[PDB]
Amino acid sequence: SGPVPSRARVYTDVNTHRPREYWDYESHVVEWGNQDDYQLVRKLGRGKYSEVFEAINITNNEKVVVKILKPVKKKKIKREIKILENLRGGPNIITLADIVKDPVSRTPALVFEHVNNTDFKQLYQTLTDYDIRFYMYEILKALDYCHSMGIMHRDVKPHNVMIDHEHRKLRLIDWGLAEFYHPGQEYNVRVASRYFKGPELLVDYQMYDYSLDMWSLGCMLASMIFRKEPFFHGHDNYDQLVRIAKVLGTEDLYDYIDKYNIELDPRFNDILGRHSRKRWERFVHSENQHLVSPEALDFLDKLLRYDHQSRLTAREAMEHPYFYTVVKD
Ligand SMILES: O=C1C=C2C[C@]3(O)COc4c(ccc(O)c4O)C3=C2C=C1O
């Protein structure tokens, strides 16, 4: 009586019919550039797996961004590199311009195109209804592209969506957690930022797919139209599901668990409780109503679904009425 198996309903066998070299990143051999071509200018951010700097290619004065990795097994590094190369040129996919060996850290440094970004914490406050629809559509292009190429991003969140607003330019970044989708494979559920983790991860259902990114995207849309970032703010992974259940309701959550025969952790019994499904309108107020429309709520509703199989795919989402004006251009 284990969980019921699941398969992506789209792009199911993209990797199954690709040459082994496309998805077998462990066998990938890195082509190293020259580190002396770059000079670090300013540290933009520091993470657990790396440090990012604003740099200059001294051979042409071009501004670039350098991500210096910390020691972390070649396999993990190769995966990110292979995924970046496979997706390079894709719509709104961050461009990996070079790969060098940092002499000081003795670790690989990934060189990316530079995006004159506007921190989401500030930007998200000035966005208009049309802006949100436009950027959502652009993110969807990136996701349909990577998904169509057999890759799940697994870390979709505001911070990983760089936006040069004046140029209406967007880039989906940080593919460090991305992975190749193979039907029937059980994946690590310890991915994505807590606030953007899909129900499947929170209930430990390992046979997930591209649909995971759609939930994370839905979380972003909600935070944007309702002006509450993050929308689902849990204290931990357990409480995260509780925050989701307080909105989507426990009825559909349990229907989801039953459908896939998922065994709920013992420490999930007395915290989920019982909650009715709240109407999206309950989150609309004077300060955000100008970003909400029947179209936006219908779209959000088709993204934030417990059952990963019932969520819209990136391609289907692009056909939603919410984007008619954007499509029209
Ligand atoms: O491929 C990329 C590219 C970037 C460019 C950038 O776009 C710059 O700025 C950043 C940052 C990450 C963290 C951070 O704090 C920050 O400021 C970046 C990346 C991460 C990636 O995986």
UniProtKB/Swiss-Prot annotation:
It catalyses: L-seryl-[protein] + ATP = O-phospho-L-seryl-[protein] + ADP + H(+); L-threonyl-[protein] + ATP = O-phospho-L-threonyl-[protein] + ADP + H(+). Phosphorylation does not directly affect casein kinase 2 activity, but may contribute to its regulation by forming binding sites for interacting proteins and/or targeting it to different compartments. ATP binds at residues 44-52, 67. One of its GO terms (molecular function) is Hsp90 protein binding. The active site is at 155 (proton acceptor). It is an enzyme of class 2 (transferase). Keywords: Apoptosis, ATP-binding, Biological rhythms, Cell cycle, Disease variant, Intellectual disability, Kinase, Nucleotide-binding, Nucleus, Phosphoprotein, Serine/threonine-protein kinase, Transcription, Transcription regulation, Transferase, Wnt signaling pathway. Catalytic subunit of a constitutively active serine/threonine-protein kinase complex that phosphorylates a large number of substrates containing acidic residues C-terminal to the phosphorylated serine or threonine. Regulates numerous cellular processes, such as cell cycle progression, apoptosis and transcription, as well as viral infection. May act as a regulatory node which integrates and coordinates numerous signals leading to an appropriate cellular response. Belongs to the protein kinase superfamily. Ser/Thr protein kinase family. CK2 subfamily. Can use both ATP and GTP as phosphoryl donors. Phosphorylation by casein kinase 2 has been estimated to represent up to one quarter of the eukaryotic phosphoproteome. Casein kinase 2 has been found to be increased at protein level and up-regulated at the level of enzyme activity in the majority of cancers. However, elevated levels of casein kinase 2 are present in certain normal organs such as brain and testes. This is Casein kinase II subunit alpha. It comes from Homo sapiens. The lineage of its organism: Eukaryota, Metazoa, Chordata, Craniata, Vertebrata.
